[PDB]
Amino acid sequence: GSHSMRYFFTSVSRPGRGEPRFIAVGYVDDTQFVRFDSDAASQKMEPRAPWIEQEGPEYWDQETRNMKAHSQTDRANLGTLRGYYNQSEDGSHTIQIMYGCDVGPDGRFLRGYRQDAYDGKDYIALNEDLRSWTAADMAAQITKRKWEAVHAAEQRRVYLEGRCVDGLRRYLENGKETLQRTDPPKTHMTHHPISDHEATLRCWALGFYPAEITLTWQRDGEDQTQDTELVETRPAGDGTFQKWAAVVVPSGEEQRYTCHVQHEGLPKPLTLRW
């Protein structure tokens, strides 16, 4: 199957005490492997997965250098955007950056990403072609013109189709046991009467990896979206995920309802019935 590598960076200005807070997180599919925290005593890129611990000291030295450069640029950019939107010095603001790439089952480059946000709203983004930029507002157009002048889109493409893809391919081979694995969901159903005429049917999916899953309730095979509570997929905290879907059914009609579970870990999709 297809794989992805994503880096998420958050920089939050503190008008009170200390330089802005910089947090960096690295993911291979739904598994975190690296982290950087400006408030932590380490002041280095730290491992979060067992398969990345085999990387040499030069790699960690290089990643730390990149994270210090990222934090410093984010610190200067917070001040630059403050002026662009004509905002006061006493307010806290946030810069978010996402970048990474996708590889196919054969390891071939699929897609490259680079998106930036100011205060949780789109600022500037690299288009799918990795040749042009999309500016969200007038202030972002200033950056767009500056980045076009220095041909920034080409330098982003060099990283995304180069080092980014090479890095992801290497991580997948080193962590084949954990990353190329599929944990199927452990399923069960609960039935609880809310009255003498109605009962809630809740279908569970636990201990699955990757996070991507589909839980759908069906009445006589027809997709029941209307009156179904579907919770957001949540982490269990052990590297696996959880999800549930509930529906209120009339008492004595439980057998007309089926829950459909779709996951890449399952050899065939499941059909659960009370």
Partner: peptide
Amino acid sequence: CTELKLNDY
């Protein structure tokens, strides 16, 4: 592996 540098806005 991450980018070596980030550009100013």
